[PDB]
Design an enzyme around this catalytic site. Structure first.
Site, PDB file in Angstrom:
ATOM      1  N   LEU A   8      51.678  30.413  79.157  1.00 12.60           N
ATOM      2  CA  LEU A   8      51.596  29.441  78.062  1.00 12.60           C
ATOM      3  C   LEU A   8      52.993  29.040  77.596  1.00 12.60           C
ATOM      4  O   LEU A   8      53.183  27.935  77.078  1.00 12.60           O
ATOM      5  CB  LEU A   8      50.776  30.015  76.906  1.00 12.60           C
ATOM      6  CG  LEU A   8      49.296  30.318  77.200  1.00 12.60           C
ATOM      7  CD1 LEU A   8      48.721  31.094  76.028  1.00 12.60           C
ATOM      8  CD2 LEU A   8      48.444  29.050  77.539  1.00 12.60           C
ATOM      9  N   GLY A   9      53.953  29.950  77.755  1.00 10.46           N
ATOM     10  CA  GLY A   9      55.371  29.650  77.549  1.00 10.46           C
ATOM     11  C   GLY A   9      56.312  30.674  78.179  1.00 10.46           C
ATOM     12  O   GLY A   9      55.913  31.816  78.441  1.00 10.46           O
ATOM     13  N   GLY A  11      60.766  31.816  77.966  1.00 11.94           N
ATOM     14  CA  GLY A  11      62.131  31.628  77.444  1.00 11.94           C
ATOM     15  C   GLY A  11      62.947  32.915  77.492  1.00 11.94           C
ATOM     16  O   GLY A  11      62.458  33.946  77.967  1.00 11.94           O
ATOM     17  N   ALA A  12      64.188  32.865  76.998  1.00 20.59           N
ATOM     18  CA  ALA A  12      65.028  34.072  76.885  1.00 20.59           C
ATOM     19  C   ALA A  12      64.340  35.149  76.048  1.00 20.59           C
ATOM     20  O   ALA A  12      64.552  36.344  76.265  1.00 20.59           O
ATOM     21  CB  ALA A  12      66.413  33.730  76.283  1.00 20.59           C
ATOM     22  N   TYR A  13      63.514  34.720  75.095  1.00 15.14           N
ATOM     23  CA  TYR A  13      62.699  35.645  74.291  1.00 15.14           C
ATOM     24  C   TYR A  13      61.778  36.503  75.155  1.00 15.14           C
ATOM     25  O   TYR A  13      61.487  37.648  74.815  1.00 15.14           O
ATOM     26  CB  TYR A  13      61.848  34.872  73.270  1.00 15.14           C
ATOM     27  CG  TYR A  13      60.720  34.047  73.884  1.00 15.14           C
ATOM     28  CD1 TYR A  13      59.488  34.626  74.176  1.00 15.14           C
ATOM     29  CD2 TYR A  13      60.890  32.692  74.174  1.00 15.14           C
ATOM     30  CE1 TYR A  13      58.460  33.885  74.738  1.00 15.14           C
ATOM     31  CE2 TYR A  13      59.861  31.938  74.739  1.00 15.14           C
ATOM     32  CZ  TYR A  13      58.650  32.545  75.020  1.00 15.14           C
ATOM     33  OH  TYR A  13      57.621  31.815  75.583  1.00 15.14           O
ATOM     34  N   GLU A  15      58.026  35.824  77.490  1.00 18.36           N
ATOM     35  CA  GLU A  15      56.999  34.872  77.922  1.00 18.36           C
ATOM     36  C   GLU A  15      55.708  35.087  77.139  1.00 18.36           C
ATOM     37  O   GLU A  15      55.513  36.143  76.528  1.00 18.36           O
ATOM     38  CB  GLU A  15      56.745  34.995  79.435  1.00 18.36           C
ATOM     39  CG  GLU A  15      56.021  36.268  79.841  1.00 18.36           C
ATOM     40  CD  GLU A  15      56.055  36.505  81.341  1.00 18.36           C
ATOM     41  OE1 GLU A  15      55.359  35.778  82.079  1.00 18.36           O
ATOM     42  OE2 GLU A  15      56.793  37.413  81.774  1.00 18.36           O
ATOM     43  N   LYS A  31      52.205  38.022  74.148  1.00 20.76           N
ATOM     44  CA  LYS A  31      53.651  37.853  74.192  1.00 20.76           C
ATOM     45  C   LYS A  31      54.225  39.082  74.885  1.00 20.76           C
ATOM     46  O   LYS A  31      53.957  40.207  74.475  1.00 20.76           O
ATOM     47  CB  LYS A  31      54.229  37.702  72.779  1.00 20.76           C
ATOM     48  CG  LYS A  31      55.758  37.485  72.730  1.00 20.76           C
ATOM     49  CD  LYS A  31      56.241  37.214  71.290  1.00 20.76           C
ATOM     50  CE  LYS A  31      57.253  36.089  71.220  1.00 20.76           C
ATOM     51  NZ  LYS A  31      57.950  36.087  69.906  1.00 20.76           N
ATOM     52  N   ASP A 115      62.611  30.815  60.467  1.00 20.97           N
ATOM     53  CA  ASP A 115      62.693  30.062  61.724  1.00 20.97           C
ATOM     54  C   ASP A 115      61.567  29.047  61.799  1.00 20.97           C
ATOM     55  O   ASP A 115      60.928  28.885  62.841  1.00 20.97           O
ATOM     56  CB  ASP A 115      62.619  31.043  62.912  1.00 20.97           C
ATOM     57  CG  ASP A 115      63.090  30.445  64.221  1.00 20.97           C
ATOM     58  OD1 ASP A 115      63.903  29.493  64.220  1.00 20.97           O
ATOM     59  OD2 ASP A 115      62.635  30.956  65.270  1.00 20.97           O
TER      60      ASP A 115
END
Ligand SMILES: NC(=O)Nc1cc(-c2cccc(F)c2)sc1C(=O)N[C@H]1CCCNC1
Length: 254
Positions: A8-9, A11-13, A15, A31, A115
């Site tokens: 679903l997504g 990133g550096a964070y 997935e 997550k 954020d």
């Protein structure tokens, strides 16, 4: 237990995966982060509200954390903002009501998100907006005693000007400002300035009340008047959420 069906997504964070239960076909978001996450979990465990992404639990397999989260099939608010257009005014108002509800809830329990931006607001299957990604969130109040914050957190276009200028600052007006920037984006499809500072031409133009320019010329006078009360440089003269709830446009049936 769970089948990981698709990404679903990423990133550096880490997935986010859609997971589907092998037995019941229940869908949840997961997550996944390869080890800050302890705090995100800690904060998530405190939350229970309809306008925040629900936390179901977590599991640590070695150095990998799996956070089990309410699946929001509507995706990121960010993908509903058409570039340089935004969205119909009534959808913008409804999302903003829901954003406010979530923020009021967080602030009531002494939590600031830090954020707030359309990438971190998700939409469920009925397009109800949910506050997401508490990885920068923190406690600002303990037993009716407020602590001022000093940490440089957020993304510059959304951050309140006091974050840059002051040694420390109240949490709540910072979240309110970011909500105003999200509102501007929803209405005009456009972020008003790269940085909330006098050296940014677009920021000074706003303080010089040049609303005949974009994005402000795309915005009707009513929500524009709310934005003049929210996007106030001095955090002590900035509108509070209790007074946002009394704004004419906020209460306008659309
Ligand atoms: N909880 C849930 O359903 N999550 C969730 C669901 C997403 C999603 C839902 C439907 C279609 C699609 F393409 C993405 S995206 C997402 C998510 O949490 N992304 C994060 C990544 C970090 C930046 N903030 C948004």
């Amino acid at each position: 237990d769970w089948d990981l069906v698709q990404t679903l997504g990423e990133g550096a964070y880490g997935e986010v995966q859609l997971a589907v239960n092998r037995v019941t076909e229940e869908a949840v978001a997961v997550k996944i982060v390869d080890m800050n996450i302890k705090k995100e979990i800690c904060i998530n465990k405190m939350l229970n509200h309809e306008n925040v992404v629900k936390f179901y639990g977590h599991r640590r397999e070695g150095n990998i954390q799996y956070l089990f989260l309410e699946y929001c099939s509507g995706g990121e608010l960010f993908d509903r903002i058409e570039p340089d257009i935004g969205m119909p005014e009534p959808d913008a108002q409804r999302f903003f009501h829901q954003l406010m509800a979530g923020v009021v809830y967080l602030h009531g329990i002494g939590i600031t998100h830090r954020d707030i931006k359309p990438e971190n607001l998700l939409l469920d299957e009925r397009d109800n907006l949910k506050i997401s990604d508490f990885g920068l969130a923190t406690v600002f109040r303990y037993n009716n005693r407020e602590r001022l914050l000093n940490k440089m957190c957020g993304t510059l276009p959304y951050v309140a000007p006091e974050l840059l200028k002051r040694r420390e600052f109240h949490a709540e007006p910072v979240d309110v400002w970011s909500c105003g920037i999200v509102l501007t984006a929803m209405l005009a499809g456009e972020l008003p300035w790269d940085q909330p500072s006098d050296s940014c031409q677009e920021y000074s133009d706003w303080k010089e009340k040049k609303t005949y320019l974009n994005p402000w010329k795309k915005i009707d006078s009513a929500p524009l008047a709310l934005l003049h009360k929210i996007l106030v440089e001095n955090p002590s003269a900035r509108i509070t959420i209790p007074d946002i709830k009394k704004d004419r446009w906020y209460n306008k049936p659309l």
